[PDB]
Amino acid sequence: LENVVLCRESQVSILQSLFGERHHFSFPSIFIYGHTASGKTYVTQTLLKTLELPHVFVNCVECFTLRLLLEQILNKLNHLSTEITCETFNDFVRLFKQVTTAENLKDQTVYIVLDKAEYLRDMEANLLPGFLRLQELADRNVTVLFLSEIVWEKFRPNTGCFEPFVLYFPDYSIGNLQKILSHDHPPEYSADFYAAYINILLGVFYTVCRDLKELRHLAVLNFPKYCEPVVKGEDTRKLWRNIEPHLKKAMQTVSAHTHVELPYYSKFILIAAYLASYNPARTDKRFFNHLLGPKPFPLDRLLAILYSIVDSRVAPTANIFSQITSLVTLQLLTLVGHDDQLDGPKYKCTVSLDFIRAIARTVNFDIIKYLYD
Amino acid sequence: GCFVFKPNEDYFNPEDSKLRFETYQLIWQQMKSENERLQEELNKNLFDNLIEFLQKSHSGFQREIPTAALVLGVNVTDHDLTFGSLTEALQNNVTPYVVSLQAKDCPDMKHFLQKLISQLMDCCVDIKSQKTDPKMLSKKRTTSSQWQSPPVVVILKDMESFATKVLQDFIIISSQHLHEFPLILIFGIATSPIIIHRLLPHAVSSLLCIELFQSLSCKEHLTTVLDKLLLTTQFPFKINEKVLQVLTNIFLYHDFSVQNFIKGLQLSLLEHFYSQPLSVLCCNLPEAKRRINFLSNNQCENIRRLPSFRRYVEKQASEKQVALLTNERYLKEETQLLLENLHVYHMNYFLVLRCLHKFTSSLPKYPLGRQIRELYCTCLEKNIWDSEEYASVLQLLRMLAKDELMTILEKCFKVFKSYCENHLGSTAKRIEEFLAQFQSLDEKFEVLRENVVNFIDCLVREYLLPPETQPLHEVVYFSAAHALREHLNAAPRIALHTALNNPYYYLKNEANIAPDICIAYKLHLECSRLINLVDWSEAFATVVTAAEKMDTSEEMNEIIHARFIRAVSELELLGFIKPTKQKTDHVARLTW
Amino acid sequence: TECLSQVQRILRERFCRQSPHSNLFGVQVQYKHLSELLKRTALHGESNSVLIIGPRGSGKTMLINHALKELMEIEESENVLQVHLNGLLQINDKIALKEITRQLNLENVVGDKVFGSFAENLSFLLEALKKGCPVIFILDEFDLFAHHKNQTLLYNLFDISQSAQTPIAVIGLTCRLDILELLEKRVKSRFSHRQIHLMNSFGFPQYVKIFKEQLSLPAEFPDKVFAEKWNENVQYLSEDRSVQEVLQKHFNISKNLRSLHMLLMLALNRVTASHPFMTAVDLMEASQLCSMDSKANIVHGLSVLEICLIIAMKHLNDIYEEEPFNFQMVYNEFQKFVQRKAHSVYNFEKPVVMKAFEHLQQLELIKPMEREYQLMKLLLDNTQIMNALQKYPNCPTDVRQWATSS
Amino acid sequence: QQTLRNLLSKVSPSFSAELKQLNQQYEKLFHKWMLQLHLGFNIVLYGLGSKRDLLERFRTTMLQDSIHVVINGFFPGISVKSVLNSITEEVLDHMGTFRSILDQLDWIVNKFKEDSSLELFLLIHNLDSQMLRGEKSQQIIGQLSSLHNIYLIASIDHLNAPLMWDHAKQSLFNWLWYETTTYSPYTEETSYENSLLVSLPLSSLTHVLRSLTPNARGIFRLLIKYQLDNQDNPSYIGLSFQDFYQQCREAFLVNSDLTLRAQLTEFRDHKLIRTKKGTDGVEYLLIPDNGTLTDFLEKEEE
């Protein structure tokens, strides 16, 4: 809540100017894209908190149906009663005229802030061009302030709409990522020294993730670990060269063991399903690139290679078929004919080769020259 | 076509049904109750670590959301029982706000939230004494303002069969505002924690706090329930080694579950109580002495005339044969001590079988039996000292004579020192007999000669094959393997192969008489590559032309074609030939 | 002062609310075609149903409300009971009937029986209105209206417009071109044809005049000296050839006359703090804040692991062309590039390389068409990536050598 | 079909005595089914010949007292909606809820836990067929039959018939598997399916039309119009899922991707939409003629 800017001042100021004072009209709709790191709700919430433009805030992650997205907008707006119910959209534009006729916001440009609008994209085809024209659909000094993860070019309805004014909130630059990744609040060191730690950590680490949230998390972990040998041992260079031996392994390490005990015929089932998925260009006849993935194959071929793999005392009982259905619910095999029938469709293999190697080796079987070579 | 008719108990069917059925209901209900307790005791080391972890991750709330991903086994058949026990333990020592989601009652998000708030509403309204999302938060804000604001936890039972869309949206909703409503979800991963990376993309997987728990790997679960349920002296109904071999095979090969095993033992006990008229006296020994003394005389002729007793007749003298043959009043006297000898053989059998289990589990590489299950198997399939496997133990046990063997003689002795007076009367007072051998363990030759007299006395005295050694053993033993196996686990793909290839039921048909349908399939697979229709109609017509002349042609072509089309709709219907669309016609060889 | 807040209040409304400014240019013959038709449908009982088509952002709603205001000014309020509909709100028939009930003041009589035949429904609405009488139907955004389940509030309006002969104009406002070909054949053969408008723009040297007549402070007087000062400044900016340079650049992307409102809207937002009379360079940066490249701002900000991955995907088009790839071929090309390189800074191990993919899927540069090694699709251009890799500020030399190799 | 079936049963099935005897072997095994079914098991019984008349003789000898919902599965009218509807009215003696399948499922579960000894048991002929099965469909039979007060008997005919039972779904109803053979030809299936020697007519489309939502009815209008409007183009190889998703979304008929995919797989059940994989790997959709597609939505709107 504290720092409104942390040097992103020009985008803040053009957005701050664009709102204007209360008694005159503003834009109908503003669309702000950017990366997920870039403060697109930190900047707009600490901008809107200062002037208290009387606003409603929503996430559309929360509202999975259309009725809740209208209900919370109307219910949060009338406080600035009972649940003022809207089943349909024309109910929202009807009840909107009564709600925004109060002295708090009769003249004031009400902002209906919509967050993470890419989840609104697949709500309906109605609601997005129905919300972009709200300044003259209901005519009550509104400005629907969008923000999103996604580019505007995909977001358009392909009929067209009121094209909103589009801002690009910039990504944080390198010296700006030195400054705004916690140059304020270092508790016990000098801010020179915490910036010296993170100025070393960041320049090494500015190639995997420029996300500010996780880098605040990683820095508030590996800074107190860096901190402890200074205040215990005692010179930034020496513990710079101590902190990078720990930083490489903490980079690499941010999945217990792959091996799962299975009943013995299910082991031989998915051994057979692997062996019929990964080299299967009618090479059944021989024994008895790889990179593209698993090729699908029918059930009767799997059953034939099952008979060749196992010792021959198998019978097709109800349990060996019921197990071969029950391997699919645990997502070790997949059906790729989605509805081709109950009769045996193509079942393609979906487990990685190391896991299959371990499953084959825990029952007496070395298979890699047998698998694709 | 589902026409309903409206209408507008002790029936079982000699073995007289009323005390038969109450004997059934007593034995099976007793076994099920002790089954559920010996489930809930083993899991206490697992989930009473869990109460510690959930207590620690709740109490430090003054950016994160805690998940404890259990790794339960591949058996989905008994995953309800561990979650019933875990719901009980978490409900008692932590909050009375515990809900569980099934992953079949919520395909998408509206059902998820509607079923979760209804389960939470009944769960809060009982122990205090709706499609909306933030009203759930208002429920937690109303319902628990106090008592350290207890954390409401959801139990996703299957992590796997959830779609990723609805689960991702719920985790971002719940992690968005857990200021009020602290939520600690515990999804039960069926495979291994690897797949929580697979089903959750990295943003939502970064949102949460993962701490994984093991679960009881399943072979040392069924060693406890096999060991406690049938290996004891206590339960009146034992089981044959072949029927047990059938039951424990379809555990360890196909199913890997324990609820199927207890269904298998349930079916064995039911079929035993149906089968034979001497099954009524499957009881403890005074309850046996209750109505051995009064009973119908034809069932006592059956207690004379079942084959193991007539072996006992074959080994005995004439002067008591002439009275014990027919008369009831002495036949009670000899059969009562025969049932006492049955209980005697069971009681001196199982204790030193457990002794031999400890003394053989101590060994390197363990050649006889891996575990306590299979020792029952090896001492009953072949005769044990006849077989090479106990020959291999006896060949092993000589030069193993060191302080490892003396130390584990001490340790095995200690665990059946607890079973010294838990046996509490042996049937030879074998506890203080073998303990009288086993009391010089504190004070290298003595381990060898003490070993010699101990295994020879033990194994040659009681450890032998139960049918021939003991008459009247039909009463406690139920044995029918391939009568039960087809009831429990059948094969229709082998039945159709047998009754379509060889439909010989009892006049000449084994290698042209009494099908229509086997004529159709057998003639289809006399031309064994693939087929077209008209020539197949002419070929079927040819072989039943042979049938007609081995007892006009145009009428015969009509009736042959009509019965052909009745046959070929079945041969499509039963999962063979699947119709070859848009061509002139053909049938496709779909099963070889 | 009085001037800055008054100019921004009076110019901002006609500027960005698309408020009714009285100057209308390019549309004089279409308007004049509309007025006598509206006067003879409104003044007399007969009902004719004109239809309007044009592009988005030009023409329609301004014309129909301007002609409506001028016709309302004539009396004998004439009792024309206008009923505004929109295509976006009233999606279905049941909402449409109660919406006509709402506009036409019907709930004095209760009418609380859903009737089966909806021609009796519409005839009842017009019937209780008629005994109580002209209506003018402005059916806006007709292209969403042409997706009814049964096309009732298309068709029954046309049948009543020929058959009931209560005074009616079904004035459709559309956006897509084929209003006839999309319309279903019983209605389109029934009564769709009354005389169809077509709407388009005009020439650039008059479009600079519509810039000046748009921007100039109106005949409304905030303070007449400040209007003379500022509209003279508008003309001085207008006669300068750099504003004419940026305005011709704006014509050849946008003939819209809505894009001009936004382009100038950012300019006037900049103006009131200092220099109230502004530069051509201020209109230049006002154009410049309106972006040209929506995807360079997405690709320019990405860290360089996503850069060498995205140019690996571009390289996956330049060998083994046109398949929707999976992860493994991307990993293979990235590894063959890093094994071409000597240094081991950028040989980042496999589980990190998935994190770049599941971040890059959220930008929808890559597309899903089995779970994490399948059939992923690239929707992009080479040349925007080739421009983006030189404008990357901390772009390393090895990914530059990757770009030059390609 | 009919003049082919006049000739059926003219003279001489070539054995009779062992067929009466092989069916007369199984009449001794019925009181076992009654006892085994009272304890909580469920009998599936498979076979090679017709055993549905055996189940009818079974219900005549031992089900004159109890409720039985004989669900045929061989004729194409029955899917599990009709099961739940008929069990709700004609067994519970009052109609139930109407909002969803899961609502009436949970509701029809709910009546049995409170009302002791109501003792209803259905029996199903031909539980595996083209219409009865399905993971939406078979689980409702499962979850319904898991209780103590419902005892289903089935018959599975297929060769791959226990492929639709994973372990969890198998433990809803405790199966034990009888073996039966009768050799009687399955006259009801072969009667009421089809005969090839003579596409789908108007009746089953009327039944699917009258058992579904009006929005699903609005959906197939769009699909049948895009099919009929391009019927004589041999390059039209069907709409994709995304084109159909946007053209169904613009007409407000459905909201999400998953709802349309579920509607597509339940309409892929009735064999009136066929998926085709092109060279993209994207599977386009085309259904099985043109003149029989004009008649419905000619008459569905005047």
Ligand SMILES: Nc1ncnc2c1ncn2[C@@H]1O[C@H](COP(=O)(O)OP(=O)(O)OP(=O)(O)O)[C@@H](O)[C@H]1O
């Ligand atoms: N300039 C800044 N100064 C301080 N903290 C910042 C700044 N920018 C971003 N943050 C961090 O980002 C958080 C706000 O996240 P942000 O505003 O990036 O969400 P968002 O952009 O709406 O997310 P998304 O784009 O994923 O919807 C703040 O809690 C803060 O931790």
Ligand SMILES: Nc1ncnc2c1ncn2[C@@H]1O[C@H](COP(=O)(O)OP(=O)(O)OP(=O)(O)O)[C@@H](O)[C@H]1O
């Ligand atoms: N000939 C013109 N005269 C005056 N203003 C015009 C003219 N052409 C376009 N405009 C302006 O362009 C915008 C057109 O808005 P209007 O809603 O009338 O048409 P539209 O936007 O194409 O309609 P829709 O909302 O269906 O797209 C308004 O700002 C209007 O002031």
